[PDB]
Amino acid sequence: EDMAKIYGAVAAVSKNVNSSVTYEVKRGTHELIKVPTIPHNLVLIQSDNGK
């Protein structure tokens, strides 16, 4: 019985080993919007007689 306790404690220590890490790489990334129209900013000014 006391041997099972000693053997169990050793197995607990051996099981404390770490395997790996996992993380997401998202820094520096931004979403993109879509502009549907082109701004021209033009107006045609014409006289009444058209000259």
Binding site: E1, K5, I6, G8, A9, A12, V13, N16
Partner: protein
């Protein structure tokens, strides 16, 4: 090294928790000796193992 100290501390706590779980591995006679100063049974056994 800080890594060795952290590894020793964590492993030692795991052993103490497992040893004192369910039926303790250590009889009550040794606990009386290690708790004469005033420290608890878990703490007294922990320093002796170190």
């Amino acid at each position: 090294t800080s890594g060795s100290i952290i590894n020793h501390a964590n492993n030692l706590n795991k052993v103490i928790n497992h040893v004192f779980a369910d039926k303790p591995l250590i009889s009550e006679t040794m606990l009386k000796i290690l708790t004469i100063d005033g420290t608890t049974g878990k703490d007294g056994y922990r320093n002796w193992l170190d």
